[PDB]
């Protein structure tokens, strides 16, 4: 079973598995049952931005999601990630649609990791047709507009249900080493969630996992393509 | 047949294949016979620093090698790398030894690529782990307990060995160009320590850019720096 650390943008309330009764963003530490969550005032059809950051001294994983012209949503959790994650990891984005759907379009994504100092940084303001520097899993694809469509969309751009997909950066990341003075990382991605459904689903996540991580079987829908069970 | 673009720190003069008659640094475009070279006043036993840069507007690949408290060595060559390299590549470092030898120790390596279609990739190693999962080690290349990358074999006692070849490629491919892109550039730097028991150290170290699936060619040892199958 993979080891997962993620920040979820949960658009669909799955109260039968721990979610609060409303769209929310949360911090998941080895389980879909977020250790911390904050109400997320979604704005489908509007481009949002998510920023995630962490450093080994403060030991506080934080995330902020926002849209232009509106107050943001933030969430944090005190945790020693070096204790949870292996020294080497791959970082990525995931998304899923189930009975209900939504577009899980990524317009841009950047990540920076520093180990005190060695470093890894990448930035995509648009994605290439054949992103050789990305590992596409499931239905994840990049469209003609240079955007990353984590889940299946029609020619018109209309979302489809029962879809799952993720994109991991090709190169493993060394997030920690013995005696390391300080290790830190931060990620940012812009997204566009659209949907005809009264209640869109299921969400998008930025996650960090073991380097050989793959879509767990039965991880569709509410499990955001990250966990095998609830 | 890989496509190679490299900046060579040629410590051994092989005049039989076009090398000038003195240690030198050079810019190689699909051939070991440098398109441009400059005399390299080596400081064996001293830590050196090499800097390589290029951008699609200026179209001038330049490299500078220096040591603390000494005059630097520079070499340049005008060339549109878009007419040579494929759109996706892997970057790396190579080194070899032949009858004569030398340590080809890399103490640090950084690289930055920018593509304004601006997308970018950047990595830096101030030390290397024993199990560098973000590096593709080829040939004899290995990282040591000191955290340094030994491109070519060195005895457990630190003494270099001849007839060795090794390379280290960064794991993720690099997108250096795309049609209609506005501008693209890359920057690379690495520090190295070349030590030798031989009056004439050989054969050299290089920073190269090649097709993503690049591998050490057969017969690329010694004077071929682990980059080419022949000296054509
Ligand atoms: Ca949910
Ligand atoms: Ca030579
Ligand atoms: Ca192209
Ligand atoms: Mn949730
Ligand atoms: Mn930040
Ligand atoms: Mn850096
Ligand atoms: Mn690209
Ligand atoms: Mn030469
Ligand atoms: Mn950048
Ligand atoms: Mn490392």
UniProtKB/Swiss-Prot annotation, chain A:
Binding site for Ca(2+): 10, 12, 14, 19, 202
Xref: Pfam families: Lectin_legB (PF00139)
Organism expressing this protein natively: Dioclea guianensis
PANTHER family: CONCANAVALIN A-LIKE LECTIN FAMILY PROTEIN (PTHR32401), LEGUME LECTIN DOMAIN-CONTAINING PROTEIN (PTHR32401:SF47)
Residues bound to a carbohydrate: 12, 99-100, 222
SUPFAM superfamilies on file: Concanavalin A-like lectins/glucanases
Residues annotated to bind Mn(2+): 8, 10, 19, 24, 34
Subunit (UniProt): Equilibrium between homodimer and homotetramer. Oligomerization is pH-dependent with homotetramers forming at pH 6.5 and above.
Function: D-mannose/D-glucose-binding lectin. Has anti-inflammatory activity in rats. Induces histamine release in mast cells from rat. Induces lymphocyte proliferation and IFNG production.
Keywords: Calcium, Lectin, Manganese, Mannose-binding, Metal-binding, Toxin
Family membership noted in the UniProt record: Belongs to the leguminous lectin family.
PTMs per UniProt: The beta and gamma chains are produced by partial proteolytic processing of the lectin alpha chain by an asparaginyl endopeptidase. Mixture of 60% alpha lectin and 40% of its beta and gamma proteolytic fragments.
Other comment: Binds one manganese (or another transition metal) ion and one calcium ion. The metal ions are essential for the saccharide-binding and cell-agglutinating activities. Is being tested as a molluscicide with potential application in controlling schistosomiasis. The causative agent of schistosomiasis depends on freshwater snails of the genus Biomphalaria as hosts during its larval stages.
A molecular function (GO) term: toxin activity
Source organism superkingdom: Eukaryota
Keyword Metal-binding: yes
Name of the featured protein: Lectin alpha chain
């Amino acid at each position: 079973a993979d080891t997962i650390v993620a920040v979820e943008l949960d658009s669909y309330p799955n109260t039968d598995i721990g979610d609060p009764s409303y769209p929310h963003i949360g911090i998941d530490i080895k389980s879909i049952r977020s250790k911390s969550t904050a109400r997320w005032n979604m704005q489908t059809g509007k481009v949002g931005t998510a920023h995630i950051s962490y450093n080994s001294v403060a030991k506080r994983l934080s995330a902020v999601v926002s849209y232009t012209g509106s107050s943001s949503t933030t969430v944090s959790y005190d945790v020693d990630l070096n204790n949870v994650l292996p020294e080497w990891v791959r970082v990525g984005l995931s998304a899923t649609t189930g009975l209900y759907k939504e577009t899980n379009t990524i317009l841009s994504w950047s990540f920076t990791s520093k180990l005190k100092a060695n470093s890894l940084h990448f930035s995509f303001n648009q994605f290439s047709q054949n992103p050789k520097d990305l590992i596409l899993q499931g239905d994840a694809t990049t469209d003609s507009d240079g955007n990353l469509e984590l889940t299946k969309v029609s020619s018109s751009g209309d979302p489809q249900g029962s879809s799952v997909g993720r994109a991991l950066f090709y190169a493993p990341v060394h997030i920690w080493e013995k005696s390391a003075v300080v290790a830190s990382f931060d990620a940012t991605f812009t997204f566009l969630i659209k949907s005809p459904d009264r209640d869109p689903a299921d969400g998008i996540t930025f996650f960090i996992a073991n380097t050989d991580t793959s879509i767990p079987s039965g991880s569709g829908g509410r499990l955001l393509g990250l966990f095998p069970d609830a």
